[PDB]
Amino acid sequence: HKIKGTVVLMPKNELEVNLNAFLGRSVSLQLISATKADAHGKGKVGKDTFLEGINTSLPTLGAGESAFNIHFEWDGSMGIPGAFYIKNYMQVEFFLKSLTLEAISNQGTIRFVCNSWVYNTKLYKSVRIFFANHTYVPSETPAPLVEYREEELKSLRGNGTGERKEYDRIYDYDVYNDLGNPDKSEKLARPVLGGSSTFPYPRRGRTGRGPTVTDPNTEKQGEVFYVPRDENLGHLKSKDALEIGTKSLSQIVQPAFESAFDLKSTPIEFHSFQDVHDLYEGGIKLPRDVISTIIPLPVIKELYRTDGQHILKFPQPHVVQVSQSAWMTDEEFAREMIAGVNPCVIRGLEEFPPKSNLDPAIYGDQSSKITADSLDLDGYTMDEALGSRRLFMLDYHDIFMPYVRQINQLNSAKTYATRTILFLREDGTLKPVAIELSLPHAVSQVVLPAKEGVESTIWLLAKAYVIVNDSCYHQLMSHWLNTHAAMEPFVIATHRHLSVLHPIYKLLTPHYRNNMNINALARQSAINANGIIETTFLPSKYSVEMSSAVYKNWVFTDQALPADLIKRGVAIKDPSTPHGVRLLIEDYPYAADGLEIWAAIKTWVQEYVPLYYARDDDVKNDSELQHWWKEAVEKGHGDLKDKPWWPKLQTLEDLVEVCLIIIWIASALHAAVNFGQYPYGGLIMNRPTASRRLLPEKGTPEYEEMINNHEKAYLRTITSKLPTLISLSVIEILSTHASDEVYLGQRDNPHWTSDSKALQAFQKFGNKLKEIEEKLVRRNNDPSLQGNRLGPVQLPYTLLYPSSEEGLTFRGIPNSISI
Numbered sequence: 030h031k032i033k034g035t036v037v038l039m040p041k042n043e044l045e046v047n048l049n050a051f052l053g054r055s056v057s058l059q060l061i062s063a064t065k066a067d068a069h070g071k072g073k074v075g076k077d078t079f080l081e082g083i084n085t086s087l088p089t090l091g092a093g094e095s096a097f098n099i100h101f102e103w104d105g106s107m108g109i110p111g112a113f114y115i116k117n118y119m120q121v122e123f124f125l126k127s128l129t130l131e132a133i134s135n136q137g138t139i140r141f142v143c144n145s146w147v148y149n150t151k152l153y154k155s156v157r158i159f160f161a162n163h164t165y166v167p168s169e170t171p172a173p174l175v176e177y178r179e180e181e182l183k184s185l186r187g188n189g190t191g192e193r194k195e196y197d198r199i200y201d202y203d204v205y206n207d208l209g210n211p212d213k214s215e216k217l218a219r220p221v222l223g224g225s226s227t228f229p230y231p232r233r234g235r236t237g238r239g240p241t242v243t244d245p246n247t248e249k250q251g252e253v254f255y256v257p258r259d260e261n262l263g264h265l266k267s268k269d270a271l272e273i274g275t276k277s278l279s280q281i282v283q284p285a286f287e288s289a290f291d292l293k294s295t296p297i298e299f300h301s302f303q304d305v306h307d308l309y310e311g312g313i314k315l316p317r318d319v320i321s322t323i324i325p326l327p328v329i330k331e332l333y334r335t336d337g338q339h340i341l342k343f344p345q346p347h348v349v350q351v352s353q354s355a356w357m358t359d360e361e362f363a364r365e366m367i368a369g370v371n372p373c374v375i376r377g378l379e380e381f382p383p384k385s386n387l388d389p390a391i392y393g394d395q396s397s398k399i400t401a402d403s404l405d406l407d408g409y410t411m412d413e414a415l416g417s418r419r420l421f422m423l424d425y426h427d428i429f430m431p432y433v434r435q436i437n438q439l440n441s442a443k444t445y446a447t448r449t450i451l452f453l454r455e456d457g458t459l460k461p462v463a464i465e466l467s468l469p470h471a472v473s474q475v476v477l478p479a480k481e482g483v484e485s486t487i488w489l490l491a492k493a494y495v496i497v498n499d500s501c502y503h504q505l506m507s508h509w510l511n512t513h514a515a516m517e518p519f520v521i522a523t524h525r526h527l528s529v530l531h532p533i534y535k536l537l538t539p540h541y542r543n544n545m546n547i548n549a550l551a552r553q554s555a556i557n558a559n560g561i562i563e564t565t566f567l568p569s570k571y572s573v574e575m576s577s578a579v580y581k582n583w584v585f586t587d588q589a590l591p592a593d594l595i596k597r598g599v600a601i602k603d604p605s606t607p608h609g610v611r612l613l614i615e616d617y618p619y620a621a622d623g624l625e626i627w628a629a630i631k632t633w634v635q636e637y638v639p640l641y642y643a644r645d646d647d648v649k650n651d652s653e654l655q656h657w658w659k660e661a662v663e664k665g666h667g668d669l670k671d672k673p674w675w676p677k678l679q680t681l682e683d684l685v686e687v688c689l690i691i692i693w694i695a696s697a698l699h700a701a702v703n704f705g706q707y708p709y710g711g712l713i714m715n716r717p718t719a720s721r722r723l724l725p726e727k728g729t730p731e732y733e734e735m736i737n738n739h740e741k742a743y744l745r746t747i748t749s750k751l752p753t754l755i756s757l758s759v760i761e762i763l764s765t766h767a768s769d770e771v772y773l774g775q776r777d778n779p780h781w782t783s784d785s786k787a788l789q790a791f792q793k794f795g796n797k798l799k800e801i802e803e804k805l806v807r808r809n810n811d812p813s814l815q816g817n818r819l820g821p822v823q824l825p826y827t828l829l830y831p832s833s834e835e836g837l838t839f840r841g842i843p844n845s846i847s848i
């Protein structure tokens with residue numbers, strides 16, 4: 030009557046940044062029957078059973094893993110197991126991977142996929158339970174397991190109170206009231222984001238540290254920002270703990286840099302473009318103290334080459350590897366709006382001039398001052414250019430104008446609100462033809478392209494002001510708001526309301542990996558008062574607040590790629606085409622490749638969903654799914670809960686489109702806007718983060734400097750040297766793939782379900798991605814597409830290749846928002 034099992038676990042030390050202790054009575058497992066119930070309808074529980082011996086002759090073991098044999102005594106009254114309890118009596122937690130049971134049931138083997146930290150049993154209010162890898166919608170749960178299933182969800186929700194501890198597995202919501210630190214200084218006070226019409230915002234994971242003394246609305250600071258324990262990913266190699274790098278950069282490296290500048294040991298400013306290129310050629314000389322702080326730190330020490338004493342050297346950014354000056358071309362400036370770090374803002378223009386929606390009673394006349402007759406449209410008239418759908422724009426006027434006055438009152442910030450007009454040439458590339466620089470009470474200056482004279486320098490500076498607008502929008506809205514922040518409410522709701530058993534849990538959760546973790550470190554170090562963003566980007570203390578203003582207009586159903594392209598007027602609906610949209614910029618790289626990835630994900634979801642839902646009524650009647658979606662909208666994105674565009678989740682089609690959008694955001698959208706940051710932005714001149722002065726007026730020294738030394742004029746206008754060093758370091762981290770990444774088309778365990786049809790559908794998805802990759806390779810070797818896919822910088826657009834090796838690769842689509 031003995032069942033042979035094998036436990037697989039990793040001791041804590043293998044995942045941090047003696048095996049015989051596990052034997053004896055150190056760790057007990059108890060089996061739980063799925064087929065035989067006690068008087069109260071609950072699956073019968075087996076006796077405490079302890080680990081018996083170390084299994085060294087197991088071939089499939091991975092790095093840092095160890096397998097223990099175990100033998101349960103399980104007689105005929107006990108039925109067939111479908112779960113188990115585990116109790117750790119050791120003082121130290123360990124990471125459990127799996128339990129395998131041999132020669133039991135009509136399937137011969139029973140597998141339990143666990144992947145969880147198991148802390149001392151005294152620390153938990155209820156015993157840890159794990160389920161076999163059989164998928165069940167709620168109405169199909171074996172009756173003896175129904176109460177276990179519901180109780181485990183109750184456990185994951187908690188009661189909405191208390192300070193969360195490192196071993197809690199409690200998923201709940203709170204507002205972004207943790208970024209300000211008013212108890213340290215009223216200068217570090219920040220508005221609460223979320224829970225009001227003034228500052229709407231997605232919710233984040235609740236931590237419960239308690240209010241500050243100066244502001245009962247704001248959460249007290251802490252040394253560790255809690256995430257539910259299994260979201261706090263360990264790593265076999267310390268260099269893969271990229272998420273901790275931003276914390277070390279803020280707390281340790283930044284102060285060290287500042288000390289070297291306060292000491293005036295290095296020059297405070299760049300003086301020529303060569304001073305910037307030196308950062309990746311010969312490097313920068315720093316004091317020994319500052320070098321000796323860097324080289325021992327995990328993650329940080331990988332970001333730089335050093336001799337260990339004085340010289341620090343950054344890697345050469347892709348954007349310059351082929352040509353050092355090509356970034357300055359009008360061609361590259363336009364091309365990066367469809368193939369760069371932020372490819373998803375450019376709009377079609379259907380009327381001219383562009384109009385503002387700003388209330389004139391406050392902002393006065395905001396209508397564009399660009400005149401059609403001033404534009405060189407390669408011989409076209411405006412009527413023809415509009416009629417052929419060749420006129421586009423990048424328009425940061427209405428978004429920035431409400432903030433320009435506040436920003437320009439800062440000591441070292443000056444910005445314009447910008448509009449850029451772009452013309453689609455007959456060779457299929459974009460030509461910038463005007464930039465409008467606006468200030469509030471509006472004052473507008475139109476700047477036209479010029480290659481000679483002082484006017485050419487003014488045009489170069491005008492482009493820098495545009496890219497400062499675009500860099501702040503990319504980081505805070507395209508990247509931080511649309512991916513990281515928008516996703517976290519769905520992570521929370523999934524764990525609160527979908528069992529580990531649920532088919533949609535298994536479909537979705539791989540795409541949540543590390544999301545909560547990186548976000549919690551980001552709230553602590555990246556978007557906090559006086560943190561990395563506020564110090565390196567233009568809007569300073571207004572940065573995160575601006576993203577709340579944009580969230581007012583966020584529409585979940587406009588995050589689907591075809592809907593986004595139509596809403597921005599860069600595509601039209603066309604049922605004759607393979608994807609149902611025709612691109613008005615034919616070669617648009619981000620969009621063309623993205624549509625291929627979108628379609629592959631759609632095929633996967635539309636195949637998986639019908640395996641578990643036959644008809645619309647099956648979706649309606651899934652109580653876990655209905656509670657999941659209700660809470661995700663009404664709590665997680667609760668400030669938008671009354672908008673009419675939320676899907677209702679009443680149909681197979683509804684469920685499909687919800688899962689498809691979530692997977693798209695977490696994988697390919699995030700990848701496209703994240704992994705190009707250092708490749709394009711590692712040259713600060715190409716992607717400035719801040720501007721520090723307005724255009725010089727005629728007759729001043731600054732204007733004469735502009736005539737005689739355009740490089741100095743440029744560098745005086747953009748990000749200063751010290752914030753440049755900090756910013757380059759952060760985007761190098763963010764642009765790096767860890768070696769334990771899980772990419773789109775892959776999963777961390779081959780046994781996540783017993784359902785062979787689901788596994789076959791998943792294999793088909795992976796094979797499709799490989800086929801797509803070969804298609805994208807061919808696109809990048811097609812000479813007729815080199816204008817937009819490579820450009821003057823000769824950089825092939827690989828950000829939507831699905832696969833990648835580790836490192837700073839400018840390719841690869843992770844499953845999730847993992848960095």
Ligand SMILES: [Fe+2]
Nearest residue numbers: 513703846848
């Ligand atoms: Fe990211």
